[PDB]
Amino acid sequence: MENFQKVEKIGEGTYGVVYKARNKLTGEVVALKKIRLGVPSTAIREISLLKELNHPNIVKLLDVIHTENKLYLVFEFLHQDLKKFMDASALTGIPLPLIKSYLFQLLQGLAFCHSHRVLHRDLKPQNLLINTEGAIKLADFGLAREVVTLWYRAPEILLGCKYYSTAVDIWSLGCIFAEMVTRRALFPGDSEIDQLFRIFRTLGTPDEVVWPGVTSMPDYKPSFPKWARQDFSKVVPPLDEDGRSLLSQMLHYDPNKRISAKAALAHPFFQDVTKPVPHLRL
Numbered sequence: 001m002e003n004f005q006k007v008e009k010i011g012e013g014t015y016g017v018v019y020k021a022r023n024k025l026t027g028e029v030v031a032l033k034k035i036r037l038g039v040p041s042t043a044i045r046e047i048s049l050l051k052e053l054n055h056p057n058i059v060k061l062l063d064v065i066h067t068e069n070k071l072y073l074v075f076e077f078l079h080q081d082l083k084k085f086m087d088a089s090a091l092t093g094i095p096l097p098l099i100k101s102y103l104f105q106l107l108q109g110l111a112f113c114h115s116h117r118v119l120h121r122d123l124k125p126q127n128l129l130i131n132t133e134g135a136i137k138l139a140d141f142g143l144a145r146e147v148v149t150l151w152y153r154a155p156e157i158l159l160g161c162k163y164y165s166t167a168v169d170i171w172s173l174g175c176i177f178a179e180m181v182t183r184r185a186l187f188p189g190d191s192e193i194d195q196l197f198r199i200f201r202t203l204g205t206p207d208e209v210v211w212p213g214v215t216s217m218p219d220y221k222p223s224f225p226k227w228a229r230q231d232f233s234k235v236v237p238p239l240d241e242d243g244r245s246l247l248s249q250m251l252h253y254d255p256n257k258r259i260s261a262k263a264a265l266a267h268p269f270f271q272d273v274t275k276p277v278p279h280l281r282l
Protein backbone atom coordinates (compact mmCIF):
# COMPACT_ATOMS: atom_id res chain seq x y z
CA MET A 1 0.00 0.00 0.00
CA GLU A 2 3.09 2.30 0.26
CA ASN A 3 2.99 2.23 -3.61
CA PHE A 4 -0.09 4.55 -3.64
CA GLN A 5 -0.48 8.26 -2.89
CA LYS A 6 -4.04 9.32 -1.88
CA VAL A 7 -5.36 12.36 -3.79
CA GLU A 8 -8.95 12.70 -2.39
CA LYS A 9 -11.90 10.73 -0.95
CA ILE A 10 -14.31 10.06 -3.83
CA GLY A 11 -17.04 8.16 -1.90
CA GLU A 12 -18.16 5.69 0.79
CA GLY A 13 -20.14 2.47 0.24
CA THR A 14 -21.30 -0.48 2.37
CA TYR A 15 -17.94 -2.32 1.87
CA GLY A 16 -15.66 0.70 2.48
CA VAL A 17 -14.14 4.07 1.48
CA VAL A 18 -12.96 4.89 -2.11
CA TYR A 19 -10.04 7.23 -2.82
CA LYS A 20 -8.65 8.69 -5.99
CA ALA A 21 -4.95 7.74 -5.84
CA ARG A 22 -1.73 7.73 -7.85
CA ASN A 23 0.34 4.54 -8.40
CA LYS A 24 3.97 5.58 -7.65
CA LEU A 25 5.26 2.60 -9.78
CA THR A 26 3.28 3.22 -13.03
CA GLY A 27 2.15 6.88 -12.56
CA GLU A 28 -1.39 5.52 -13.04
CA VAL A 29 -4.38 7.35 -11.52
CA VAL A 30 -6.71 4.80 -9.92
CA ALA A 31 -9.65 4.37 -7.53
CA LEU A 32 -8.48 2.68 -4.35
CA LYS A 33 -11.10 0.93 -2.25
CA LYS A 34 -10.27 -0.10 1.33
CA ILE A 35 -12.56 -3.01 2.31
CA ARG A 36 -13.73 -2.82 5.94
CA LEU A 37 -13.31 -6.28 7.56
CA GLY A 38 -8.36 -11.51 8.61
CA VAL A 39 -9.96 -11.66 5.13
CA PRO A 40 -12.10 -14.80 4.48
CA SER A 41 -10.78 -17.30 1.86
CA THR A 42 -14.28 -17.35 0.19
CA ALA A 43 -14.02 -13.53 -0.44
CA ILE A 44 -10.44 -13.78 -1.83
CA ARG A 45 -11.48 -16.50 -4.37
CA GLU A 46 -14.69 -14.64 -5.45
CA ILE A 47 -12.89 -11.28 -5.83
CA SER A 48 -10.06 -13.03 -7.79
CA LEU A 49 -12.78 -14.27 -10.25
CA LEU A 50 -13.90 -10.62 -10.82
CA LYS A 51 -10.34 -9.72 -12.04
CA GLU A 52 -11.07 -11.86 -15.11
CA LEU A 53 -14.62 -10.44 -15.72
CA ASN A 54 -13.33 -7.80 -18.21
CA HIS A 55 -15.62 -5.75 -20.50
CA PRO A 56 -15.57 -2.15 -21.91
CA ASN A 57 -18.72 -1.30 -19.85
CA ILE A 58 -17.38 -2.77 -16.58
CA VAL A 59 -15.02 -0.69 -14.40
CA LYS A 60 -11.74 -2.65 -14.57
CA LEU A 61 -10.55 -4.35 -11.34
CA LEU A 62 -6.78 -3.80 -11.76
CA ASP A 63 -5.50 -5.54 -8.61
CA VAL A 64 -6.50 -7.22 -5.34
CA ILE A 65 -4.06 -6.37 -2.51
CA HIS A 66 -4.49 -8.68 0.49
CA THR A 67 -2.05 -7.37 3.18
CA GLU A 68 -2.11 -7.35 7.07
CA ASN A 69 -5.77 -8.59 7.55
CA LYS A 70 -6.82 -5.59 5.33
CA LEU A 71 -8.19 -5.86 1.77
CA TYR A 72 -7.63 -3.20 -0.94
CA LEU A 73 -9.19 -3.17 -4.41
CA VAL A 74 -7.45 -1.13 -7.15
CA PHE A 75 -9.88 -0.04 -9.88
CA GLU A 76 -9.84 1.90 -13.10
CA PHE A 77 -10.65 5.61 -12.41
CA LEU A 78 -13.49 7.56 -14.15
CA HIS A 79 -14.09 11.27 -13.57
CA GLN A 80 -17.85 11.45 -12.85
CA ASP A 81 -20.78 9.28 -11.72
CA LEU A 82 -24.28 9.28 -13.28
CA LYS A 83 -25.74 10.79 -10.07
CA LYS A 84 -23.65 13.98 -10.41
CA PHE A 85 -24.30 14.08 -14.19
CA MET A 86 -28.11 13.76 -13.63
CA ASP A 87 -28.02 16.55 -11.00
CA ALA A 88 -25.94 18.77 -13.40
CA SER A 89 -28.37 18.06 -16.33
CA ALA A 90 -31.61 18.54 -14.26
CA LEU A 91 -32.71 21.93 -15.68
CA THR A 92 -32.42 20.80 -19.34
CA GLY A 93 -32.60 17.01 -19.03
CA ILE A 94 -30.13 14.50 -20.49
CA PRO A 95 -30.78 14.41 -24.31
CA LEU A 96 -32.78 11.29 -25.36
CA PRO A 97 -29.93 10.05 -27.73
CA LEU A 98 -27.49 10.10 -24.75
CA ILE A 99 -30.02 8.35 -22.43
CA LYS A 100 -30.45 5.71 -25.18
CA SER A 101 -26.65 5.29 -25.64
CA TYR A 102 -26.11 4.94 -21.86
CA LEU A 103 -28.97 2.42 -21.49
CA PHE A 104 -27.68 0.38 -24.50
CA GLN A 105 -24.11 0.32 -23.09
CA LEU A 106 -25.26 -0.75 -19.62
CA LEU A 107 -27.39 -3.52 -21.13
CA GLN A 108 -24.23 -4.70 -23.01
CA GLY A 109 -22.31 -4.80 -19.67
CA LEU A 110 -25.13 -6.67 -17.92
CA ALA A 111 -25.55 -9.14 -20.84
CA PHE A 112 -21.80 -9.92 -20.44
CA CYS A 113 -21.80 -10.35 -16.59
CA HIS A 114 -25.11 -12.31 -16.68
CA SER A 115 -23.64 -14.67 -19.38
CA HIS A 116 -20.90 -15.46 -16.79
CA ARG A 117 -23.57 -15.98 -14.03
CA VAL A 118 -22.39 -12.77 -12.22
CA LEU A 119 -25.06 -10.46 -10.74
CA HIS A 120 -24.49 -6.84 -9.73
CA ARG A 121 -27.39 -6.82 -7.11
CA ASP A 122 -27.05 -3.11 -6.22
CA LEU A 123 -27.19 -0.96 -9.36
CA LYS A 124 -27.73 2.75 -8.68
CA PRO A 125 -26.63 6.06 -10.32
CA GLN A 126 -23.74 6.27 -7.78
CA ASN A 127 -22.03 3.13 -9.16
CA LEU A 128 -22.52 4.05 -12.89
CA LEU A 129 -19.40 5.94 -14.06
CA ILE A 130 -18.95 8.07 -17.14
CA ASN A 131 -16.05 9.52 -19.16
CA THR A 132 -15.59 12.28 -21.77
CA GLU A 133 -15.78 9.78 -24.68
CA GLY A 134 -19.47 8.94 -24.11
CA ALA A 135 -18.78 5.66 -22.29
CA ILE A 136 -20.71 4.48 -19.22
CA LYS A 137 -19.46 1.70 -16.92
CA LEU A 138 -20.77 -0.53 -14.12
CA ALA A 139 -18.84 -0.29 -10.79
CA ASP A 140 -18.95 -2.07 -7.37
CA PHE A 141 -19.94 -5.35 -9.10
CA GLY A 142 -19.89 -8.95 -7.75
CA LEU A 143 -18.75 -7.59 -4.35
CA ALA A 144 -22.20 -8.32 -2.77
CA ARG A 145 -21.66 -12.10 -3.31
CA GLU A 146 -24.93 6.13 5.66
CA VAL A 147 -28.40 4.67 4.87
CA VAL A 148 -28.43 2.03 2.05
CA THR A 149 -30.71 3.28 -0.80
CA LEU A 150 -33.71 1.05 -1.58
CA TRP A 151 -34.94 3.00 -4.63
CA TYR A 152 -33.65 0.52 -7.19
CA ARG A 153 -34.39 -2.73 -5.32
CA ALA A 154 -36.36 -5.40 -7.28
CA PRO A 155 -39.73 -6.44 -5.64
CA GLU A 156 -38.64 -10.11 -5.31
CA ILE A 157 -35.76 -8.95 -3.01
CA LEU A 158 -38.17 -6.80 -0.94
CA LEU A 159 -40.60 -9.76 -0.70
CA GLY A 160 -37.85 -12.00 0.75
CA CYS A 161 -36.61 -14.08 -2.20
CA LYS A 162 -33.23 -15.46 -1.08
CA TYR A 163 -32.24 -17.00 -4.46
CA TYR A 164 -33.06 -14.16 -6.83
CA SER A 165 -31.78 -13.96 -10.41
CA THR A 166 -30.10 -11.71 -12.98
CA ALA A 167 -33.60 -10.13 -13.38
CA VAL A 168 -32.88 -8.01 -10.26
CA ASP A 169 -30.31 -5.98 -12.31
CA ILE A 170 -32.77 -5.40 -15.16
CA TRP A 171 -35.30 -4.02 -12.61
CA SER A 172 -32.67 -1.60 -11.15
CA LEU A 173 -31.64 -0.45 -14.66
CA GLY A 174 -35.33 0.13 -15.61
CA CYS A 175 -35.65 2.38 -12.52
CA ILE A 176 -32.50 4.34 -13.58
CA PHE A 177 -33.79 4.62 -17.21
CA ALA A 178 -37.09 6.17 -15.91
CA GLU A 179 -35.13 8.59 -13.68
CA MET A 180 -32.90 9.75 -16.57
CA VAL A 181 -36.05 10.48 -18.66
CA THR A 182 -38.22 12.19 -16.02
CA ARG A 183 -35.44 13.82 -13.91
CA ARG A 184 -37.05 12.31 -10.78
CA ALA A 185 -36.52 8.99 -9.00
CA LEU A 186 -39.22 6.46 -10.01
CA PHE A 187 -39.70 4.79 -6.57
CA PRO A 188 -37.99 6.87 -3.82
CA GLY A 189 -38.86 4.66 -0.81
CA ASP A 190 -37.41 5.42 2.63
CA SER A 191 -38.19 2.01 4.22
CA GLU A 192 -38.69 -1.48 2.84
CA ILE A 193 -42.51 -1.25 3.13
CA ASP A 194 -42.58 2.33 1.71
CA GLN A 195 -40.44 1.03 -1.21
CA LEU A 196 -42.79 -1.93 -1.81
CA PHE A 197 -45.94 0.21 -1.47
CA ARG A 198 -44.54 2.89 -3.88
CA ILE A 199 -43.99 0.09 -6.47
CA PHE A 200 -47.52 -1.27 -5.83
CA ARG A 201 -49.13 2.20 -6.12
CA THR A 202 -47.63 2.65 -9.62
CA LEU A 203 -47.57 -0.89 -11.07
CA GLY A 204 -50.57 -2.32 -9.12
CA THR A 205 -50.49 -4.73 -6.16
CA PRO A 206 -49.13 -7.98 -7.66
CA ASP A 207 -51.34 -11.07 -7.58
CA GLU A 208 -51.21 -14.67 -8.81
CA VAL A 209 -52.41 -13.52 -12.28
CA VAL A 210 -49.43 -11.25 -13.11
CA TRP A 211 -46.91 -13.03 -10.80
CA PRO A 212 -47.53 -16.78 -10.18
CA GLY A 213 -46.16 -17.74 -6.77
CA VAL A 214 -46.15 -14.14 -5.38
CA THR A 215 -48.62 -14.92 -2.56
CA SER A 216 -46.27 -17.69 -1.20
CA MET A 217 -43.19 -15.40 -0.96
CA PRO A 218 -41.58 -15.10 2.50
CA ASP A 219 -42.58 -11.48 3.21
CA TYR A 220 -45.81 -11.47 1.22
CA LYS A 221 -48.83 -10.52 3.36
CA PRO A 222 -52.47 -11.11 2.27
CA SER A 223 -53.20 -7.87 4.20
CA PHE A 224 -51.20 -5.80 1.61
CA PRO A 225 -53.50 -3.01 0.27
CA LYS A 226 -54.77 -3.70 -3.25
CA TRP A 227 -53.91 -0.77 -5.61
CA ALA A 228 -54.76 -0.56 -9.34
CA ARG A 229 -52.01 -0.21 -11.97
CA GLN A 230 -51.18 3.16 -13.69
CA ASP A 231 -50.42 3.79 -17.43
CA PHE A 232 -46.77 4.30 -18.42
CA SER A 233 -47.93 7.36 -20.39
CA LYS A 234 -48.59 8.89 -16.89
CA VAL A 235 -45.43 7.36 -15.30
CA VAL A 236 -42.67 8.43 -17.75
CA PRO A 237 -43.90 11.34 -20.00
CA PRO A 238 -42.74 12.34 -22.65
CA LEU A 239 -40.97 9.00 -23.39
CA ASP A 240 -42.06 7.56 -26.80
CA GLU A 241 -43.94 4.24 -27.21
CA ASP A 242 -40.71 2.31 -27.96
CA GLY A 243 -39.13 3.51 -24.68
CA ARG A 244 -42.34 2.89 -22.67
CA SER A 245 -42.67 -0.65 -24.16
CA LEU A 246 -39.06 -1.48 -23.24
CA LEU A 247 -39.44 0.03 -19.75
CA SER A 248 -42.62 -2.00 -19.14
CA GLN A 249 -40.70 -5.23 -19.98
CA MET A 250 -37.84 -4.26 -17.64
CA LEU A 251 -40.39 -3.61 -14.82
CA HIS A 252 -42.45 -6.84 -15.10
CA TYR A 253 -43.23 -8.20 -11.61
CA ASP A 254 -42.52 -11.85 -12.44
CA PRO A 255 -38.69 -12.18 -12.70
CA ASN A 256 -39.27 -14.96 -15.29
CA LYS A 257 -41.32 -12.59 -17.53
CA ARG A 258 -38.87 -9.64 -17.04
CA ILE A 259 -36.82 -9.03 -20.20
CA SER A 260 -33.20 -10.24 -20.24
CA ALA A 261 -30.30 -7.86 -21.05
CA LYS A 262 -29.68 -9.77 -24.35
CA ALA A 263 -33.35 -9.56 -25.49
CA ALA A 264 -33.48 -5.85 -24.41
CA LEU A 265 -30.56 -5.05 -26.80
CA ALA A 266 -32.76 -6.24 -29.72
CA HIS A 267 -35.76 -4.09 -28.67
CA PRO A 268 -37.00 -1.64 -31.42
CA PHE A 269 -36.09 1.28 -29.01
CA PHE A 270 -32.44 0.75 -30.01
CA GLN A 271 -33.15 0.89 -33.83
CA ASP A 272 -31.62 4.40 -33.99
CA VAL A 273 -29.03 4.06 -31.18
CA THR A 274 -25.88 6.27 -31.52
CA LYS A 275 -22.93 7.20 -29.26
CA PRO A 276 -23.09 10.96 -28.51
CA VAL A 277 -20.43 12.79 -26.50
CA PRO A 278 -21.73 14.28 -23.20
CA HIS A 279 -21.01 17.81 -22.08
CA LEU A 280 -18.84 17.08 -19.03
CA ARG A 281 -17.60 19.82 -16.74
CA LEU A 282 -14.79 18.32 -14.60
Ligand SMILES: NS(=O)(=O)c1ccc(N/N=C2\C(=O)Nc3ccc(C(=O)NCCc4c[nH]cn4)cc32)cc1
Pocket residue numbers: 010011012013014016018030031033059075076077078079080081084085126127129139140
Ligand atom coordinates in the same frame (compact mmCIF):
# COMPACT_ATOMS: atom_id res chain seq x y z
N1 LIG B 1 -19.38 12.44 -7.49
S1 LIG B 1 -18.34 12.52 -8.74
O1 LIG B 1 -19.08 12.64 -10.03
O2 LIG B 1 -17.38 13.66 -8.62
C1 LIG B 1 -17.41 11.06 -8.86
C2 LIG B 1 -16.15 11.11 -9.45
C3 LIG B 1 -15.41 9.92 -9.58
C4 LIG B 1 -15.91 8.72 -9.09
N2 LIG B 1 -15.22 7.57 -9.26
N3 LIG B 1 -15.47 6.52 -8.62
C5 LIG B 1 -14.84 5.36 -8.85
C6 LIG B 1 -13.90 5.13 -9.87
O3 LIG B 1 -13.40 6.00 -10.59
N4 LIG B 1 -13.65 3.83 -9.96
C7 LIG B 1 -14.41 3.18 -9.05
C8 LIG B 1 -14.46 1.83 -8.70
C9 LIG B 1 -15.32 1.38 -7.70
C10 LIG B 1 -16.10 2.30 -6.99
C11 LIG B 1 -16.98 1.75 -5.87
O4 LIG B 1 -16.70 0.66 -5.36
N5 LIG B 1 -17.95 2.55 -5.44
C12 LIG B 1 -18.86 2.16 -4.34
C13 LIG B 1 -18.67 3.11 -3.15
C14 LIG B 1 -19.16 4.52 -3.45
C15 LIG B 1 -18.45 5.49 -4.03
N6 LIG B 1 -19.22 6.57 -4.11
C16 LIG B 1 -20.41 6.28 -3.58
N7 LIG B 1 -20.37 5.01 -3.18
C17 LIG B 1 -16.06 3.67 -7.33
C18 LIG B 1 -15.21 4.10 -8.37
C19 LIG B 1 -17.18 8.69 -8.50
C20 LIG B 1 -17.94 9.86 -8.39
